[PDB]
Ligand binder design. Structure first.
Ligand SMILES: [As]
Ligand SMILES: [As]
Ligand SMILES: [As]
Ligand SMILES: [As]
Ligand SMILES: [Zn+2]
Ligand SMILES: [Zn+2]
Ligand SMILES: [Zn+2]
Ligand SMILES: [Zn+2]
Lengths: 198, 198, 198, 198
DNA sequence: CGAGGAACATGTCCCAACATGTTGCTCGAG
DNA sequence: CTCGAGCAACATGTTGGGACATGTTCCTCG
């Protein structure tokens, strides 16, 4: 009631998410772990998420992205950037400095603040795949480390991506855990390799 | 001269309770012992209780939660927080500081005080399971240790969850014993392991 | 918030403190450890402190007793009783319920609350030793355990006894650490025996 | 482009600094390394510095304390608390939240902010040693870790203590390096033991 | 150069140990 | 036949510090 749904819902347009499978290096900047359904992303580093749909949705549909804290203790608290990072000037003009999740290189972006929950989100209108493509990509990037004292303060978060009509109705939903850190490469291996033993 | 009924009553909507109980660690924060029908919960730690129903109940139905002391000597006394804990500021805004049981992350919550019995309770309107889910979860948390001098003072309590219509009528009821303590992990094992011998 | 001096000062009247050396039992209620200069006292149990003086001081001299927290972190905070204990009715009429240190069986006692510091103290006029005695005794007792959640909260305290003239001047000062606990006997041995090793 | 002098100057009153030599434990909160002339202090932990003087200075003399960054690159920058720590409410009323160095339990304290340099300091009037004592102690505590992102940001600092007359003149000066950290014990040993090898 | 990957620096966490109040269990009295 | 005083045993919250977590620096090498 106070905490956005995290439930996967492919909807009637077959809304699914994809990620660029890389990892053949060690000095990696952004990577995805299908086992953990978790993305390992460096701070303020562009990372493509791609949208897949069986059918094309009607014009006026938008995709919003919103972080929530994963653990139940913290769910209720709003995910914002840390005092340090909001005050240091790194904006791209458009993005309010307090917002964690911004969208790179999309002029029709809007940064929003729900009047009831107070959560931040970032919405962009849906575009269908370009000709000769199977998916639309959004380039998000996250503007704090997970360990930022005063912000996420070492707590893991989820990123929920919804597909919504003009009127704000839900057409589909997906989610994935995110860890923003200095060494995605290292943190990637450690977590997957810790999983094998257990 | 009135203690609420503690009797299990699944009612005509098949009201039952479920718990995660996942554990598998030692540093556990919340766990459930089916053998003891008891929950072991840390102080102010979110712990999911989930509601199961054969049929969906009519709109306007609400679920209330209320603590009573388990032992017969004490049943009659009202379960409230200790002097220390009511006066220390830890409220979430909504929850009156004297109330033991609060509900995390539900905006339509109400904290009540029965004009006849004087017992506290916390009610939230019933929501059916989200699509592709079998149960509705509530996230309670308990705001004093069981051993709190001046409150429960080392006396065990029960938590009674009822399902009620708008008008206050009973549609179903369940209950489980609760121990709020610093070390749920330890206290869990001890009690189960003490049970085997006897 | 400035802190009363803790400095020993025997002054020009040779103000010293004495205690009844007992300990030949295990079920002890009040005992003194010269090594630690610490008293081990049960809650609300009368314990004699005795005053020794080389010279007799002028009429109108008073002795006040005041607790402060020992550690430097906490010195600044005023020592009061816990929420449980102030609200439970155990007063002897004279003693305000918030005051930690009271004096047994002295009708001319006064309980003071400094309008600037807010510290409590308990003053009684000085009487010289009775004929054929070498010291005057005061019977203090402490109205909370050291471990009282919401009060001293496991922090050790000092008790400062000053000898003051009518005009408020300092004539002498002494101090001793106090631990109020359920088992003085046990807590006595443990601390002395732990001192040897270190 | 004006950095306060760091030069030791014992002056005509023989102004020197002393520290409580402890360290017989591992879980240490505040310690001093004579070799390094450095103090290892936990965050917001009271730590005594003591003033020694051959002769007593005239009434109206004050002692001020001021942090500056040690390295030459950074000297020029003002030492303040981090964005997280200034905004979190932990004040004792008197201390402005941005000030790094505060003084515990002295009511005549003043927090100063130089209209030209913008440096912070904390001044308290000098008191001579209490009777039967060889030094006056001040209880400082530092309100950020050395590693605080957005504040000192892992850069070491110096603490300069001056002895000044009413009129603002210099009567004496001393200094010592400070590291505020979570584990003073560990960080103490590491640095002394690293010194041997080099 | 700097890209890469150690090693380093630095704050947290886990849980056995410890601390501390309470409830048995035992055995010599009124 | 009990009954209570005094310890052992238990109950329960807190601590201590080695192992982790996590960002930053710093040598090695195409
Ligand atoms: As990414
Ligand atoms: As729970
Ligand atoms: As005593
Ligand atoms: As210190
Ligand atoms: Zn940040
Ligand atoms: Zn409580
Ligand atoms: Zn108390
Ligand atoms: Zn800081």
């Amino acid at each position: 009631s106070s905490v956005p749904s995290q439930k996967t819902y492919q909807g009637s347009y077959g809304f699914r998410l994809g990620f660029l499978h890389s990892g053949t290096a060690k000095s990696v900047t952004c990577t995805y772990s299908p086992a953990l359904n978790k993305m390992f992303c460096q701070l303020a580093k562009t990372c493509p998420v791609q949208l897949w749909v069986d059918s094309t949705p009607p014009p006026g549909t938008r995709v919003r992205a919103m972080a929530i804290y994963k653990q139940s203790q913290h769910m209720t608290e709003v995910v914002r950037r840390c005092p340090h990072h909001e005050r240091c000037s790194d904006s791209d003009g458009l993005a309010p400095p307090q917002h964690l999740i911004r969208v790179e290189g999309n002029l029709r972006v809007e940064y929003l603040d729900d009047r009831n929950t107070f959560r931040h989100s970032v919405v962009v209108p849906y575009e269908p795949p370009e000709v000769g493509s199977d998916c639309t990509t959004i380039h998000y990037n996250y503007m704090c480390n997970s360990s930022c004292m005063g912000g996420m303060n070492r707590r893991p978060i989820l990123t929920i991506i919804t597909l919504e009509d003009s009127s704000g109705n839900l057409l589909g939903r997906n989610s994935f855990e995110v860890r923003v850190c200095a060494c995605p490469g290292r943190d990637w291996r450690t977590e997957e390799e810790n999983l094998r033993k257990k």
